[model samples]
Target chain A: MKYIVANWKMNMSLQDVIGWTAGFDTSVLNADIEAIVAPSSLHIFPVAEILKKTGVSVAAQDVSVEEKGAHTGETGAFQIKELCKYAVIGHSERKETPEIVAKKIDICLTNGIIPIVCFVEPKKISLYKRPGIMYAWEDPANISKNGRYKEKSEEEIKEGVNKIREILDDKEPLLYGGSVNGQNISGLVNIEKLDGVLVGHASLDPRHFSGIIASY
Target chain B: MKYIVANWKMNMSLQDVIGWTAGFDTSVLNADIEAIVAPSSLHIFPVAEILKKTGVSVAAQDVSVEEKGAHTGETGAFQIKELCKYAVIGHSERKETPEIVAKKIDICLTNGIIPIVCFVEPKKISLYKRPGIMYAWEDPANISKNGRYKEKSEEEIKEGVNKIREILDDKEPLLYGGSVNGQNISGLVNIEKLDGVLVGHASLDPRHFSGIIASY
Candidate 1:
C-alpha cells in the first residue's frame, strides 16, 4: 500500500486542528493508499480523537528514546502509542545522534508502534535498517530552509530510493519527503522504486493535502 | 503567589489523566498558592480542557528551542502557549546544552509562556538568569533511581534557593523539586527564601498532590 504521511511540523493551533480535521475528506482515501497526519505533540490526542472514525490514522511527530521516568518535556514512545499508530523519527532538523536515533526506533518497535525513520543522507540509511518498520522517510532536502532550498532531482530521489531498497528488506516501504505537494505527487508516485511520499508544508492545507492524496 | 507545579514526567495515560484530573479538587487551591500540572504531551490538551474552569492551569513538560518548522518530534513554545501557560525547560534528564536551554527560555518568554527552567547544580543557575521567567525548578536529586536517590538536605535547598534568588529578580519564584511530598512540604514551605516546590511522584496521586498544595 502507498502511504501519504503529513508531518505538520510546528504548525496549527487547537482551533486550526479542529477546523482542518473537520474539513478533511477521508472518503477520498482507498485501500491502495494509506494517509496519516503527524501533528505537533500538543494536538496529537485531540486530533486523533477527531479522526478516529475516519480512515486516516494518527502519527506523532516525535517519540522519546527513554521508556519512562523524570525525562521531563519528552513524549515517551509508550505515550505516543496510546494515540498514534506511527511516529516520525530522526528527521534532519532534530540532528539526533546515531545512538539516540537507534534507541528511538527500539522504543517505538518495542511498544508496537511503527517508526518512520527519516534520513537526510543515503550513507546514514544503513544504520536504521531493521525488520517490522514499515516506512522509512528519506528527507534529503535542506530542511533548515523549510523547503525553500533546492530538493533532490527525480534521478537523485530514485537513486536514494534504490539504495534504501537494497539495504532494507523487500517488505519495507521507502517514502521521500520535503517540498512534497500535489504538484510533485504525479512525478513522485511514478518513481519505480518509491513507495510513497512524506509531505510537509503542503499538508497543512486541506485542499492541497486532499489533492495530493487523490492524485495517488 | 507561590507556584506548586507538578512535573508528571513521562507518566499517566489518557484514562489516568482523565481520572486524576476529574478527581482533583481545585477548589482547595487559594489565592496565595497557584497550581499547575505538566502532564505528558499526549494528555496536555485533554487535561487542559478538563481543568479550564478550575483554578488550576496546564503546563507542558518540555518545549522545543526552535520557534517553528521541520524540527520533527518537537513541541514548540508557540504551540504550548495555545493550551498551556507554563513549560518546563532544562530538566536534568533532558541534558540539553546551555545554548539549547537558553534558546528554550527565550522562546517561552517571547511567546508569553512562563518557563519553569530546571537546574541540577546551583552553579548552572546563574547562566539562566533572566527577567520574564517567573519560576525556576531546582532538582538536585538523582532522578534515574525514581526518588531512591539522596535528595538535597534542607540546608542545601535553602542555599540553592538563596543563590538563585541572588541572580534572579525578587519577583521570580524559585521552586525545589524531586522526591518532594506532603511530609516534606511543611518544612519546605518554612524555608526562609524558598518560594515553592515542584512535586514529582507525589503529584501523580490526586489526594497527595492536593495535599502538597494545601500544605503551602
Candidate 2:
C-alpha cells in the first residue's frame, strides 16, 4: 500500500493539529493507500484523538532509544508504541554520525516498533539491510529539496534495488520518500524492487498527496 | 496561583496518559492552584483533549530554541504557544552544556512564551532575578532526593533569596524545586526568599504532593 505520510516536523500546536485533521477531506483517501500524520510530541494526543475514527494512523517523528531509565529528556518506545502505530528513526538530521544512527535503528527494532529508516547512507544501505525493517530511499538531491527521489542511472537503480531486495521480507513495506510527486510515480512503479512511496512535501497539499496516490 | 505541574519525562503512552489523568483526583485540588500535565510530545495533544473540560492545563515538556528554519528536527515555540500555555526549557537534560541551555531560554523568552526554567544557577540567579518570568530554583545538591531546603546553611539560603531579590524582578515568583516535601514546607516558607516550591519525586505520590502543598 502507498504510505503518504506528513512529518509535520515540529510545526503546529494541538489546536492547529485538530483544525488541520478536521479540515482534511477524509473521503478523498483510497483504501489502496495508507496515510498518517506525525506532529510534534505536544500535539500527538490531540491529533490522534481527532483521527481515532479516521482510519489514518499516527506516528512519532522521533523516539528515544532507551526503553526506560534516566534518559530524562527523550521519549521512550513504550510510551510511543502506546499511542502511534510507528515511529521514525535515522532521519538525515539525526544521523549526525553513522554509528549513532545505526544504534538508534537497533533500538527501534528491539522495542517491537516499526522503524521508517531514512536512506542517508546510500553506500551503507547494505549495513541496514536487515530483516523486519522498512527502508525509505530517496535521491540525495530530492532529499535536499523535498521528498522526491531524483532520477538515477539504470546501473545505479539496479544496485539500489539489489540492496533493498537483500533485506526485503514479504511483510516489509519499502517506501520512496524525498521529492516524490505525481509526475514521478510512474518512474517508481516500474521498479519491481520498490514496494511503495512515502511522499513528503507533496503530501502537505491534500489534493496533490491524494493525486499521487491515484497515480499508483 | 499555585501550579501542580507533572513532568512525565518521556515515559507512558496515550493510553497510559488517558488512564492517569482519568484517575487523578481533581476534586481535591484548590481552584487557585493551576494543575498542568506535560507528556512526551507524542501524547501531549491526546492528553490535552482528554482533559479539555477538567480545568487542567497541558504543557510541552520541551521546545526548540530556534524560531524556525534550518533546525531540521526541532520543535518551535509558536507551535507550543498555539497548543499549550507553558513550555519547560533548560531542564537538566538540555543543560548538559551551558551554551545549549542558555540559547533555549533566550529563544523561549523572545517568542513570548512561558518558560518553566528548571534547575537554576545561583550565579545567573543574581542576574536573572526579575519579573514577568517564572524562575524555578532547585537545590544544586540532592535535587531529586526527598528532603527540605530548611536544613541548608543560612548563607546558602540568603544566597538564593538575595539572588532573586537582586537579579530577578521583584514581582517574579521564585520557586524552590528539588527535594521539597511536607516535612519541609515550613522550612521553605521560612526561607522568605522563596514564593513557592516545585517538588520532584514527592509529586508522583498524589497524597504526598497534596499534603506538601497543603502544609505550605
Candidate 3:
C-alpha cells in the first residue's frame, strides 16, 4: 500500500489544526493509499476526533520510551495508543540513540501502535527490525528550514533508498521525507523502490497536501 | 510566593484529563500560592482552557530544546508558549545534559514561558542560573515506581536545598520533587529553604493534590 503521512512537526495551533483537518477533503484518498497526519501532541486527539470518520488516521510526532510513570514531559505509547493508531519514532532532529529508538519501537508495538520509524543513517536502520513494523521513513537531509532548506539530489535519494532496502524487509513500505513538496513528490515517487512520500510544510496547506496526495 | 507545580508525567487519557481539570476546584487555591499542573502535551491546551479563569495555571510536562523547526515528535517552546504559560525542563527521568537544559531554559525565557528546570545533581544546579528564571525543580531520585522508590531523607533534602541556594539568585524559588505527596508535604514544606513542592502521583488525585497545596 502507498503511504502518505504528514509530519506536521511543531507547526499549527489548536485553531489551525481544527481548520486544516475540517477543510481537508478525505474523499480524494483511495484504498491504494494509506493516509495519516501526525499533528503536534497538543492537537492529536482533537484532530483525530475531527477526522475519525474520514478514512484518515491520526499519528503522534513522538512517543516516550517508557510505559507510564515519572518520565515527566513524555507521551507514552499507552497514551498515544489511546488517541492514535501510529507513532513516529527516531526522527533525525531527535538524535535518539539506537537503544532508545529500539525501546520506543518496542513500546509502540507492545501497546499495539504502528511505528513509522525514520532512518537518516542507513547503518543504524537494521537495529530496529521487528515483526509488527509495516513502514520506515527515509529522510537524509535537514528540512527544518523550508525556505532556505537544501533538497537531496536524485542520486542521493536513490542511494538512501538502496541503503534502507538493505536493512528493511521488502514487504515493508519505505517512505521518503525532508523537503518533500508537491513539485518534487512526482519525481521522488518515480524512484522504483519508494512507496510514498512524507510531506512536511506543504501538508499544512490543504490544497498543497491534497495535490501531493493526488499526484500519486 | 509559594509555587505548587504538579508534573503529571506520562499518565492520564484525554477523558481523564478533561475530568480531572473540570472537577478541579481552582477556588481552593489562594493568592499566597501559585498553583500549576504540568499535564502531558496532549492535554495541556485543553486543561489550560479548562482552568483559564481559575486561580491555577497550566504547564507543559516538557518543551523541545529547539525554538522551532523539523524536530519531529517535539513540542517547541514557541508552540508550548502559545497554549501554556509554563514548561518543565530536565526531569530526572530525562537525563539531559547541563548544556541542553541551559538551552531549554533560554528558549523558555525567550518565548515568555516560565521554566521549572529540574536539576538532580547538586553541582549541575548552579549551571542554570539566569535572570529570567523564577523557579528550579530539585528531583534527585527515581520516583516513578512509588512502591520501589526511595524518598529523600531530611538531611539529604536539606543539603540539596543548600546546594541549589548557593548558585540560584535569592529571589528564585526552589521546589523539590520525587515522591512528593500530601502525607509528606506538610513536613517537606517546613524546610525553611524550600519555596514549595513539585508533586508527581499525588497530583493526579485532586483531593490529594489539593491537600498538598493546602498544607502549604
Candidate 4:
C-alpha cells in the first residue's frame, strides 16, 4: 500500500488543527494504500477524533525509545498509541547520529508500535533490511526541501530500489517523503521499485493533498 | 524542604516495575521535602501505579517542547503527564544547546507539568530565569567530568546561590544534581540559599539515595 503521511511540523495550534483537518473531505481515504496524518501532540486526540470513523489513521511526529523517565524533552509511544496508529522514527532533525537512530528504532519496534523508518540517505536502509522486521524508508532529500530526485537516471532509482529489495525482501516497504506534490508524483510513481511516498509541507493543504493522492 | 529524586536512566521494563517500587518503603517518605522517582517511559505507568496513594510521585525522564505532531524521536508533555506527576525538563544530555533547553522549559510550564529543569552550567540558569518559572541549577563542574566539583569555599557557594536568586525569585527552587552524596549533603544544606539537590549516578544505588535523603 502507498502510505501518504503529513508532518504538520512545529506549526498549528489546537484551533488551527480543527480548521486544517476539517477542510479535508476525509472520504479521500484509500484502502489500496494506507493514508495517515500526523498532527502535533495536543491535537493528536482531536485529530484522531476527527478522523475516527474515516478510514484515515493518525501518527505521532516522534516517540521516545525509553518508555518513560528522566530523559526529559521526549514523548512516550504508549501515550501516542492512545490517539494514533503509527510513530515516525528518525526524522532528519532528531536522527543526526546513527547510534541514536538505531536506539530510537529499537524502542519503537519493541513497544509493538509501527515505526516508519525515515532517512534521506539510502545507506540508512541497509541497517533495517533484515527479516522479522517490516520497515519503511524515505528519501531524506524530499523531507524538508521537497527537491525531486526523479531527475536521477533510471539506473540510480533502480539501483536504489533493487539494493533495498536485495537486503529486506518484498515485505519492507520503501516510501519517498519530501517535496512530493502533484507536479512530481508521476515521476516517483514511475520508479519501478518505489512502494510509496511520504508527504510533508504540500500535504497540509487539502486540495494539494487530494491532488497528490489522486496522482498515484 | 529537601528534594530527593531518583533517575532510573535507561533502566527497567514494564513487567519489572512493580518489584522495583514494591521494594521501596513508603513510610520512609517524610513531609520534609517533596519526593519524586522518575522511570523510563515503559515503566512510568507501572511504577506510578505502584507508588499510588503513597507520598512519592513519579516523573518522566523528558518531554518535548513540541505540543504535538510528527517529531518521531520526541515525546510530548500531553502524553507523559498521563503516567507521571512531574516531568524532568532539561537534563544534561538534553542541554547540549541553549535554545533547545529554553523551549523545553516552556513546554513543561505551559502544560501544567512540574518541570525539573536541569541547568548543567550555572550561567545557563540566567537564560531560563524568567519570572514565575521554577527550575534547578545543575552545577556543571560537578557533573561535567570525573564526577565531583572540587570543594568550594563558602563564599563561592553563596555567590552562586545569590546569582540564581537574583534572577529567579524564592518560589523557583534551585536544586543541585551531579555527584551529590551523603557526605556532601550537609555542605549543600548549609549553603544559605541552596534549595535542594538532584542526584544522578549516585541515585542508581538505593543505599546512596537513602543516605543522601537522611543526610539532608
Candidate 5:
C-alpha cells in the first residue's frame, strides 16, 4: 500500500472540500494505493462519509497532544479517530516538539489510527520510531532557498530519508513533502527509499490532484 | 452598542454553515448592535465572505497566543485578524489556563481583533487587564448540571459581572454564557454591565438564533 496525502492545511472552504470529493477520481483509489485527504478538522467527518465508497481515506490536519478535555479549540484524536484513518502530526508549517509528537503518535496508535509523523529533522526519528507510524521527510535548508521557495532534490530527500530509515524499520511508509506536484511527482517516486508524497498547494484543485495521482 | 457572539465550537458541517448564513437575519444588526459568528479556522474565510456585507462579523474559534510560527495545528491571530473582528478565548470545553488566556487576549488586541475572553471564574479577570477587550462569564459549575444543562443564577451572574467591571473600565464589553437560550435570554438582557451574550449550541439554528436575538 502507498499514499497520496493532500494536506489541505488552513486552506479550503466548504465548497472547496465538497468540490474536491465530488471531482476526485473515486476509481483511482483501491486497497493497494490509498489516497488520504487531510482537510482541517471540522470537515473530516463529511469528507470521510462522502469518500467512503471511493476507497479514499481521511486525515486530520492536526490532533491534540492531550486527550479530549480542557484544551480549548483543540481536536482530540479520540473524537477524530472514528472518521480519520490517519493524521498529519508535526506538519512542517506548524511543528510540535519531539515529546509532544511522541504523545500524539501514541494517541494515534492506541486508537488504531496511523500517525504520519513529519520529522522535524532526519535524526528526529531516533527519539520515537515504531511500525504503526509513518514518516515524511524534507531538508530544512532546502525550504525557502530562493526568494520564493524550493522543493527538496531527489538526492537530498534520499539522504534525509536514509537517516530516518537507518533508525526505523522498513515497515513504516516514508514520504517526501516539499512543493510536490504532478510535474515532479513521477521522478520523486523513483527515489530509493521514498514511499509516497505529501502534497501542499497542488492539492487545492481536484482535477490537478487527479493528474498527480495518475502520474504516481 | 452591543454584541451577540455565536461560538460554533467544533460543530457545524459545511452545509450547516451555509444553511445558517442563508437563513440568518442579516438585517437584525446595525452599528449600535453587532453579531459575531466564530467558526473553526478553516471556515472563517468563507463565513466572513458570505456575511461580510451583512453587518455580522466573524471570529476564529481559537487563536494561538504566539503571533506565528512553530506551533503545529495552531491558528495564529495575525493571519486571522483581517477577517475576524473577534476570537473566542478560554472556552470551557477546551480550557486553556489563565496564563495562556492572557497571552491570547494580548495577541487578539495587537491584531485589532477583540478577544471574547471566557472567564471560568469571575476573579480570573484580575489576571489580565486592558481596554478594547471584551469579557464573557460562563460558569462550568452550572453547565450540564443535569442532562438538560442549566444557565447560571441571574443574581450570581450579576455579581460576577460586577467583579469583572470592578477590575476594568466600561469600555470593555462583558458577556454572560451558561446554556443561554431564547427562553431565558430576555431575563439576561437587563443585567447591569452585561454588554451582550456569547452563545454556544443554542446558536446553531438560524431561526432559533433569530429568536435569541429578538429577546435581547
Candidate 6:
C-alpha cells in the first residue's frame, strides 16, 4: 500500500482536531493507499475515535523510551499503543539522539506499534534499522521555511533513498517527509525506491491532505 | 491553599485512568486543599472528562517549548490550555536543560496555564523564577529505588526549600516532590516554607494517593 501519513506535528486543539477529522474525506482511500494521521499526544484518542472503522488510522508523532512508569512529563509506548498502531520517532525537529531514538523504537516495537522512524543522512540508517519498522527520509534541506518549500533535487533524494536502501532490507515502506505537500508529493511519489510520504505542514488541513493523498 | 498535585507521571492507560478517576474520592477535597492530577499527556483529556465537575482538576505531565508549529512529537502548551489549567515541566527524569525548561515555562505562562517548574538544584531556582508560576523541589536523592523511598533528611529538604524561597516572590505554592508518599506526606507538609507535596509513585492508586492527601 502507498502510505500517505500526515504528521500533524504539535498543532491542533481538540476542536481543530475534531474539525480536521470530520472534514477529512476517507472515502478516497482504497486497497492501494494506507492513510494515517499522527496528531500530537493529547489529541490522538479523539482523532482515533473520530476516524474509527474508517480507512484512516491513528499514530503518535513520538513515543517515549521509558515504558509506563514514573518518568514525569513523558508519554510511553504502552500508552500510545492503546490507541495508536504507529508512532513516528526521530523527527529532525525533535532532535532526539540516535541512541534515544533506538530505545524509543524498541519500546514502540515491543508494544507492537509500528515506528515510522525519520532520518536525514542515509548512512545513519544503520543506527535505527530494524524489522517491522517503517523509515521516512526527512532531509532538513527540503523542509519549508518562511512559508515556502526549499527545493531538494530529485536526483539527490533518489541517491539518498538508494543509499538507505543499500543499508536497509528494503522490506518496509520507505517514505519521504521533508516539507512535503501536494505539489511536491505528486513528483516524489513517482521516484523509484520511494514507497510513500510522511506529510508535514500541509497535512494540518483535511482538504489539503486529501489532495496529497489523491495526488498519486 | 494546600496543593497536593498528583503527578501520575508516565503511567496509566485509558482504562487505568478511568478506573483511577472513578475510584478517587473527591469529597476529601476542601477549600483548604487544591488538588490537581497530572496524567500522561495522552490520558489528560479522558481524565479531565471523567473527573469533570469533581473537586479534582487535570494537568499535563509536560508541555512543549514550541507553540503550534511543525515541531513534530512535541505537545505545545496551547493544546494543554484547552483542557488543563496546570502543567508540570522540568522534571528531573525528563532531563530538560534549564534553558529549555525556561522556554517551556514561558510558553506555559503565555498560554495562561500555571507551570509547576521542577528543579533539583536550589541555586538554579533563580533561572526560572517568575510570577504566576509554581515551583516544585524534586531532589533526586528522595526518588524511589527498587520500589521503595530513598529517605532524604527533612532538615536537608527544609534547607533546600529555604534556599529556593530566598529567591522567590513566594506568592505561588512551593511544593516538595521527591519520593513523596502517604508515610512522609504528614511531616513533609510541616516543612518550613513548603506549601504542599507533589506525589509520585503512590499517586498511581486512588486510595494510596488519597491517603497521602489525608496524611497532611
Off by over 4 Å in 6: A153-170, B153-171, B190-192
Candidate structures ordered by DockQ, highest first = 6, 1, 3, 2, 5, 4
Off by over 4 Å in 3: A121-125, A137-145, A148-170, A187-194, B121-125, B137-169, B189-193
Q: What overall lDDT, based on C-alpha atoms, would model 4 receive against the true structure?
A: 0.66
Fnat, one value per model = 0.86, 0.46, 0.75, 0.22, 0.21, 0.94
Runs of candidate 4 exceeding 4 Å displacement: A1-89, A92-116, A120-133, A138-216, B11-17, B144-159, B169-171
Candidate 4 per-residue lDDT, tens place, B173-216, comes to: 67766666766678888886777777766665555676677665
Candidate 2: residue B16 Cα off by (Å): 4.2
Cα lDDT tens digits, model 1, B1-216, are 788888888877777888998789786799898899999988888988889878888888888777666667777888889899888888877779989989989999999999888887667877888877755555544342555534566777777677776766565677888678876678788986677878887888899899888887
Docking class of 3: medium
Q: Candidates' DockQ values?
A: 0.74, 0.46, 0.58, 0.16, 0.21, 0.78
TM-score of chain A of each: 0.92, 0.80, 0.92, 0.84, 0.90, 0.95
Provide the lDDT at B45 for model 5. 61
As a whole number from 0 to 100, the lDDT of residue A112 in candidate 4 is 66
User: Which model is ahead, 4 or 6, in terms of DockQ?
Assistant: 6
A1-216 per-residue lDDT for model 4 (tens digits): 677777776555555667776778766666776777876544566677677677777877777665654344345665565556677767786745767667766776666667777776666777654433435555544354433333334455567777776765666667766566777778877775677777777776777776777666
Model 6 residue A2 CA deviation in Å: 1.1
List the global CA lDDT of all models. 0.80, 0.64, 0.79, 0.66, 0.73, 0.84
Select the stronger candidate by lDDT from 1 and 3. 1
* Candidate 2 residue-wise lDDT at A57: 80
- Report the C-alpha lDDT of model 5 over A1-216, residue by residue, as the tens digit: 568888776565456678888788766665667788887654665677688667788888787776633344765676667678889887766656788888888989987889998876777877767768888875445433222347667676667777777776555688877778766788887775777888777777787777777765
Error of 2 at B202 (Å): 2.2
lDDT of 6 by residue, B16-105 (tens): 888888788877887888889998888887788778578777889888878777788888889999999899989898888989999999
Residues A1-216, model 1: lDDT tens digits:
789898888877778889898778887898899899999988988888888668888999878877676667777888888888999888877888978888988999999999898877667877877887755555654342544635567777777677776776475778888687665678888885777888888888887898888887
